């Protein structure tokens, strides 16, 4: 179907959209469009595209399609495929040498550097109104950044990985667990000319590489996590560190679940 | 003794040389006049200490031959109605503490850091935040100070609250104290026991002296603060902020100092 | 000077800026910037550039220059010359085959065509909130359009003419009045290879063509007029026609005064 | 004070004696004039340091009585429009680093050896290669140098970047520093504290001085480089290359040296 296809897309970010069920349960377009939007926004925070400065909408067209839009302008439709959506987002983002977004989550306006001490940041969390920090190296290969808009502060934690890199990570895991050592050697010697992901796909049925490209996992993967704090907690420094630890461990589990899901896909792929 | 001259003497009570009487004779178009009038009223508002920066102050020449004073678009008073009427119009809009400082946040609804704040935490807000505002903090001598930034401009207000009636009694004392005829000076100090310093010098009771000077702008508006502004990179340099705080307190002492001199000239006659 | 140069620029739109005098009369930057802005906006309505959808600012730089900006972005400085300002505006405008702006004064959003009857427009003037009309052919080679933003309606009347076309119109008038018929014939036979404006300039001193290019009249001319109606009059249909007739005759006089000014410039050009 | 004389003074700012005014009076055919004009503009381009050698610079006499300046076939500006307009026309085409040198490769798209290169590796490219180009490398003193070859001709450009405005302030200092009346010299140095070296000498602010000299070619074009060329067997002799590098730096010091002398004559009057 088409609503289920949008769901498989949201699953690549760890979002339980369940639009196929809502689209079934009769329903007004407003609930559909509203639920589609709330799903697409939640997915943007984890894909690591770096488009927080944009308004993300998902609407149900009179075609029967699902139109995904940025700043009110149509990006692609779900019926176009997920490569069209990734290629739609592609010119909209600017990524540095680490795969981190060069854009600012609050738009243009000064944002502090990553060299900022936690004490100077502590007063920004407690006595500034709107502020943003650049990317600073997080705890263990991870990266992080913080910003507040209005009465809500946002902490983002990112371990940048492309969809191809996420699949190669799970391709290593699959080959590492083949009980047949003979097949294992065969896959390892062909990994020189084809790579780990290419060697595994070559030893599947002839259409696996093509079937893989049609899945949303081929172009979208969990790259970051966003934790929100509101009310008085948004100005609490200790509460901020508590949310930072909560988010980095949430990203690690989501990135861990993705590898397990991809492993069972590289073993069986329609 | 015209109407444009009436505004000039009103701006003269804030140390603002509007030169509206010349610009009126200048055969300048009305748009330039309204701009000169409006920008002058804003300059005076920062020095009158009414604490109405959260309002949009506006002045415009009526097609009636008068000039109208607006706040947030609604007309408050017209200059031909008397300077007390404008003071009476502003007064209900003001929220003043027991020290004479506005409790109004200059930036509106939001977070306001306390005057308790250490200068150390202030320096971070100057350099790494965007929009911020502090409350009232005790400054050099008996003055008070606050600081805020809206967009690309930084605002430094240092104030020493003194009512218009309080400035009159102080100038009335400076003239009474300077009286060389011990016999005449003793007479005024005898009247001041009941009628006060201003009532004694005017040979009346207190409220009678207030009624004598009713149409005088100096009897309704004085200078209680000074606003120094920085824009651009200087608005983010804490070394240049500190410099602006001193320039504002120096101009406050100067502008507060010439109003008691000018007032002595007014009171010395009768 | 530099402030006088901005004034000569405003004179090309029929605006009495008088900034050289204000810049002399001491003054705060805010009055300068505010007066500069109010002047530049009034001039945009008559130059016929078609940039109503833009925010026009003019500020005094710390250089001593005058910075003209569009939507908050610097376009050019007065010290750069007027060709730089015209070339700055040039890529910002879209003009049709008649020299009329293809942009909308209210931005994107539906606007009615020029084929709209006055009766259908009458209800738009009386019961719509925000509306705009496309260019319709006005009364006698003239063009017109109407729109309302908020509590203010705007009627624009335009006789499109480039600065070169305005100068050639005044070049015809100068040659048509030469008492020396011999010189007249001489200028007319050279008008075949050089044109009317080129022939007259050739018979002046050798540096007139270069001196002409440095004047603001070489790149800016009165092309339209804008009449504003506010309050209850903004919704009055008869008052709208009264303003339309007021504006088209204002443009005709302004275009008539320009030709007279240019005639006395082509006769004498420093 | 004609138009051909206007080009000659424009070429005089690059040390190029075009003698176009004489060639115009010479009753020479237009093809010879366009050739003299075009080849002169190319000579000046190598010394202006605009770094536009990847472009085809062209000049031709319009049938309008003007002369038109082309780059890659498209018209950039016409000489009667003012020398700033030509500077303003070239400026967006330039790509300049923080040192004032063109980042543009003189040969276009291809490989460019770095300025890091040892002279040893350069000698092989001189003797055994065909087409090659080096980047910018620090040369004798504070100058910079690059070298390239296209076909049978070798190009040696040595540059010391200095803007036109920077050359004016330097000449304004040389005249101010030479003032013998200690009283007058002290006055100019007091103005230079705010208005700068050029503004102080002209009795104005900085932007006012820029506006005074607007129509002067020396205010928009100076010499920042020199190009020395070898063709034939000398273009493959590293011993003759080294000789050309010195001849170019000697002519750079000479041509840069006479522009500050000539500029002192210009500034000394007012």
UniProtKB/Swiss-Prot annotation, chains A, C:
Record comment: activity regulation: Phosphorylation increases DNA binding affinity.
For this UniProt record, give its keywords in alphabetical order, as a comma-separated list: DNA damage, DNA repair, DNA-binding, Phosphoprotein, Stress response
| Post-translational changes noted in the entry | Phosphorylated by RqkA in vitro. Phosphorylated primarily at Thr-61, and to a little extent at Ser-101 and Thr-133.
The PTM Phosphoserine maps to 101
Biological processes per GO annotation: cellular response to desiccation; cellular response to gamma radiation; DNA repair; double-strand break repair via nonhomologous end joining
Q: Which domain of life is it from?
A: Bacteria
Null-mutant phenotype, please? Answer: Cells lacking this gene show a reduced growth rate, do not exhibit a decrease in the efficiency of natural transformation, but are much more sensitive to ionizing radiation than the wild-type strain.
Biotechnological exploitation: The PprA protein combined with an immunofluorescence technique can be used to visualize radiation-induced DNA strand breaks in mammalian cultured cells, allowing the evaluation of DNA damage responses. This detection method could also be applicable to genotoxic tests in the environmental and pharmaceutical fields.
UniProt induction comment: Induced to high levels following extreme ionizing radiation exposure. Also highly induced in response to desiccation stress.
GO molecular function ontology, one term from the record:
double-stranded DNA binding
In the record, which positions carry Phosphothreonine?
61, 133
Q: What does the function comment of this entry state? A: dsDNA-binding protein that contributes to the ionizing radiation resistance of D.radiodurans. Plays a role in DNA repair and genome reconstitution, and is necessary for recovery from severe genomic fragmentation as a result of exposure to severe levels of ionizing radiation. In vitro, binds to double-stranded DNA carrying strand breaks and stimulates the DNA end-joining reaction catalyzed by DNA ligases. Thus, PprA plays a critical role in a non-homologous end-joining (NHEJ) pathway for the repair of radiation-induced DNA double-strands breaks.
This protein is called DNA repair protein PprA
- Its encoding gene is what? pprA
């Amino acid at each position: 179907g088409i609503y289920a296809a949008f769901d498989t897309l949201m699953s690549t970010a760890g979002v339980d959209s369940q639009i196929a069920a809502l689209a079934a349960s009769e329903a007004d377009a407003g609930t559909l469009d509203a639920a589609l939007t709330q799903s697409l926004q939640e997915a943007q925070g984890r894909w690591g595209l770096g488009l927080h400065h944009l308004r993300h909408e998902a609407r149900l067209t009179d075609d029967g399609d699902i139109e995904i839009l940025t700043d009110g302008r149509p990006s692609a439709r779900v019926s176009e495929g997920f490569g069209a959506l990734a290629q739609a987002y592609a010119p909209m983002q600017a990524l540095d040498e680490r795969g981190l977004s060069q854009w600012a989550a609050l738009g243009e306006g000064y944002r502090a550097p990553g060299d900022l001490p936690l004490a100077q940041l502590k007063v920004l969390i407690e006595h500034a109104r709107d502020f943003e920090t650049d990317w600073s190296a997080g705890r263990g290969e991870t990266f992080q950044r913080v910003w507040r808009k209005g009465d809500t502060l946002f902490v983002e934690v990112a371990r940048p990985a492309s969809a191809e890199a996420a699949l190669s990570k799970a391709a290593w895991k699959v080959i590492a667990s083949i009980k047949d050592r003979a097949f294992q050697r065969e896959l390892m010697r062909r990994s020189e000319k084809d790579g780990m992901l290419g060697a595994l796909l070559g030893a599947r049925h002839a259409g696996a590489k093509a079937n893989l490209a049609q899945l949303p996992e081929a172009h979208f993967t969990v790259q970051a996590f966003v934790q929100t704090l509101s009310g008085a907690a948004a100005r609490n420094a200790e509460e901020y560190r508590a949310a930072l630890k909560t988010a980095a461990a949430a990203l690690e589990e989501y990135q861990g679940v993705t590898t397990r899901q991809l492993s069972e896909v590289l073993r069986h792929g329609l």
